Design a protein around this ligand. Structure first.
Ligand SMILES: [Mg+2]
Lengths: 52, 153, 48, 56, 114, 52, 28, 48
């Protein structure tokens, strides 16, 4: 009787564009689960990465 | 008059003990310019978001998060008002029940910044599924210079 | 084999936290450097 | 396992924050009432700076 | 003119106070709005009471709340220890518990002596 | 002998100690009792119903 | 920090206590 | 059981002496710091 809107394909594509990134309201955003996705300890989030 | 002020400065030049005493008086006067203690206080509620956007997680996302500093020993006092609830954050290794009339303490210290999710882990009614927990962790200098300035009256 | 996988994962976590401490030691040195710069400015502020 | 149980109390430091968590039907409530005080960071360098400001 | 070889202790103390103040008002300010780069913020919470060892900390809340009003009765209203007890119970007790306790005190249903 | 003495020194003494309505006194989580308002076997309620 | 699709073991940790719990579990 | 009790007591004695050494390091650091302050005073006593 209710299929949630976060399983629609538009939501899925827009989420896959972002990835596993969590926003913060007092700080720059951060990568979620930094061990199983193997983010190095110098990088905290995408905006703080600033790729060379 | 004015030479006695200059004679006081000459005694500052000559006597080391008077120099140390007037240095201590300078330290006493500089502590008087330090602002006094102010209380930080808040009381907000945290509710599940009914509709989420991409970049947010369904069921687990709230409107108001709990903001905690890192590398700090934090006491968490857990209680309830009507029925039994359990405050569970699986990433931080804390799961302790909220009992009406009890005040259960948790000692917690977070290693890294991030956004940690959780749910309630004690059956409490029809909407037991829809009480999620989100903890935002920031650095202690940000916490003590920017976040706590939001709660000064 | 299971304990080998676990030790591998713990090795990555230890390297992660070592890198994080390496980064976090960098901002706090530059903060004290800026503090010493402001001290050197306040030094000539009371001598000029 | 016994050693991990007895390590759950970690009060061997100065506590830095207290947060009161209250569970209601159906939401969470967070509370705090602490005091923020400021301290002069390394005052003895300022003490010496004032000393050499007053000696001349 | 009274020189340093002829001045008394109280005049010398006032001269020391004038000498210190006239320069630290230039250094730090008259109010202290200039030390914001040389100030370290620190947050004060309720200390660990050895008398209350269990994970349930309701009794620590209650005893601190009662020690506040005992201090208020015995050692005045503005004693530092009474403020310590007040900040100690405010740091531990939920606000609903405290407001229930003042309505029980106002209704006369508090079993404390004071 | 003492029980036969007690049967004759029974409901003759009286107590006039009213009890203040403490939160732990006279719990009424539901309205009343299944039989009536006061407690069973309770001729004279002793908890203040005025409070003052 | 958050659960993942098709996940087998625990989530990643941010306290030493939670890591010690996971270490004890893997030892068992 | 007896040897476990004795080992626990020896652990307490070792922790006691470690905390005593932690205390004892603090007074003698502030002693040499005071000596260096007196040296910094006598330095300008012969330079003024
Ligand atoms: Mg349960």
């Amino acid at each position: 009787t209710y299929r949630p809107e976060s399983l629609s394909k538009e939501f899925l594509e827009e989420q896959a564009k972002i990835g596993e990134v969590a926003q913060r309201m007092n700080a720059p955003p951060v990568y979620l689960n930094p061990f199983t996705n193997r983010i190095p300890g110098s990088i905290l989030g995408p905006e703080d990465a600033k790729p060379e | 008059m004015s030479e006695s002020k200059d004679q006081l400065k000459e005694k500052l030049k000559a006597d080391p003990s008077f120099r140390a005493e007037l240095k201590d008086r300078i330290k006493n006067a500089l502590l008087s310019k330090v602002p006094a203690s102010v209380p930080i206080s808040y009381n907000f509620d945290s509710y599940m978001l009914t509709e989420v956007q991409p970049g947010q997680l369904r069921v687990l996302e709230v409107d108001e998060r709990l903001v905690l500093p890192t590398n700090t020993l934090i006491r968490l006092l857990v209680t309830a008002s009507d029925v039994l609830h359990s405050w569970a954050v699986p990433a931080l290794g804390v799961k302790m029940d909220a009992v009406p009339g009890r005040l259960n303490q948790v000692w917690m210290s977070i290693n890294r910044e991030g956004v940690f999710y959780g749910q309630c882990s004690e059956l409490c009614g029809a909407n037991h599924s829809f009480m999620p927990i989100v903890v935002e962790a920031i650095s202690p200098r940000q916490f003590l210079t920017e976040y706590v300035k939001k709660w000064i009256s | 084999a299971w304990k080998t996988w676990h030790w591998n994962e713990k090795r990555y976590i230890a390297q992660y936290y070592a890198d994080m401490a390496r980064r976090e030691a960098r901002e706090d040195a530059a903060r004290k450097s800026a503090l010493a710069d402001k001290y050197k400015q306040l030094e000539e502020e009371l001598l000029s | 396992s016994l050693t991990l149980i007895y390590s759950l109390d970690q009060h061997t430091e100065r506590p830095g924050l207290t947060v009161k968590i209250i569970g209601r039907q159906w939401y969470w409530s967070y509370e705090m009432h602490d005091h923020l005080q400021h301290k002069l960071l390394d005052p003895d360098r300022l003490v010496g700076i004032a000393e050499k400001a007053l000696v001349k | 003119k009274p020189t340093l070889e002829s001045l008394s202790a109280d005049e010398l103390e006032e001269l020391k106070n004038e000498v210190v103040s006239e320069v630290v008002d230039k250094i730090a300010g008259e109010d202290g709005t200039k030390l914001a780069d040389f100030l370290e913020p620190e947050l004060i919470t309720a200390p660990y009471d050895p008398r209350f060892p269990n994970r349930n900390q309701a009794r620590h809340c209650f005893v601190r709340f009662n020690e506040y009003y005992k201090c208020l009765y015995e050692r005045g209203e503005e004693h530092p220890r009474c403020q310590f007890y007040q900040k100690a119970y405010q740091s531990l007790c939920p606000s609903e518990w405290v407001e229930s306790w003042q309505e029980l005190r106002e209704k006369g249903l508090w079993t404390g002596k004071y | 002998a003492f029980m036969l003495y007690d049967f004759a020194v029974g409901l003759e003494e009286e107590h006039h100690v009213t009890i203040p309505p403490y939160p732990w006194m006279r719990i009424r989580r539901l309205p009343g009792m299944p039989w009536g308002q006061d407690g069973l076997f309770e001729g004279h309620p002793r908890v203040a119903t005025t409070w003052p | 920090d958050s659960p993942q699709p098709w996940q087998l073991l625990f989530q990643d940790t941010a306290t030493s206590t939670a890591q010690a719990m996971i270490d004890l579990h893997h030892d068992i």
